[PDB]
Amino acid sequence: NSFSGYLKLTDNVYIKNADIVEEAKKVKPTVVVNAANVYLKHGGGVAGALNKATNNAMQVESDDYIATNGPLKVGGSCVLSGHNLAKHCLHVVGPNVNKGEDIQLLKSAYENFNQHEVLLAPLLSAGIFGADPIHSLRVCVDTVRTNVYLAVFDKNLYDKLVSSFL
Ligand SMILES: CC(C)[C@H](Nc1ncnc2[nH]ccc12)C1=[SH]CCC1
């Protein structure tokens, strides 16, 4: 968990302008969080980038999990292997607000982080799911109580988050 170059926002939330895949390769954290969907189909965004970096081993494992357990609920999670990127991957489903899913489920999504002492994570629901990224960071800060290191792969968005926060 050798995180470097983060800015501490609160007692337990840190943030960096970085690709989460590059962070995972350098740090080999105990847990990396995936911004997943309910069927664990890693087609784009953070999910597609993490899966590509495992050479599709994450997708093969996810398909087997879904066959045996069924889909996750919105706001839910499962713990699977982190493959070459981390000890574990915590797959978390935030609401797709562009498709009418309730934004209050973003609090339930972030609550899953509290089962792990230290996590490398992305900003939930901030991609194609359509939540305001600054609102997602506010819910993270007011929900997560364990130590989370947020990687945001966009310098313009990073600067807007840090200006709004501090
Ligand atoms: C908001 C956006 C810049 C961010 N993308 C990323 N954040 C961190 N590492 C990344 N690697 C590849 C994409 C990527 C997302 S997509 C879904 C949730 C958060």
Curated annotation (Swiss-Prot):
Cellular localisation: Host endoplasmic reticulum membrane
Regulation of its activity: Inhibited in vitro by GRL-0617.
Domain of life per record: Viruses
Catalytic activity line of the entry: Thiol-dependent hydrolysis of ester, thioester, amide, peptide and isopeptide bonds formed by the C-terminal Gly of ubiquitin (a 76-residue protein attached to proteins as an intracellular targeting signal)
Domain Macro: from-to ranges: 1-166
Its membrane topology: Multi-pass membrane protein
Function: Responsible for the cleavages located at the N-terminus of the replicase polyprotein. Participates together with nsp4 in the assembly of virally-induced cytoplasmic double-membrane vesicles necessary for viral replication. Antagonizes innate immune induction of type I interferon by blocking the phosphorylation, dimerization and subsequent nuclear translocation of host IRF3. Also prevents host NF-kappa-B signaling. In addition, PL-PRO possesses a deubiquitinating/deISGylating activity and processes both 'Lys-48'- and 'Lys-63'-linked polyubiquitin chains from cellular substrates.
Quaternary structure, from the entry: May form homohexamers. Interacts with N protein.
Name listed for the protein in its UniProt record: Papain-like protease nsp3
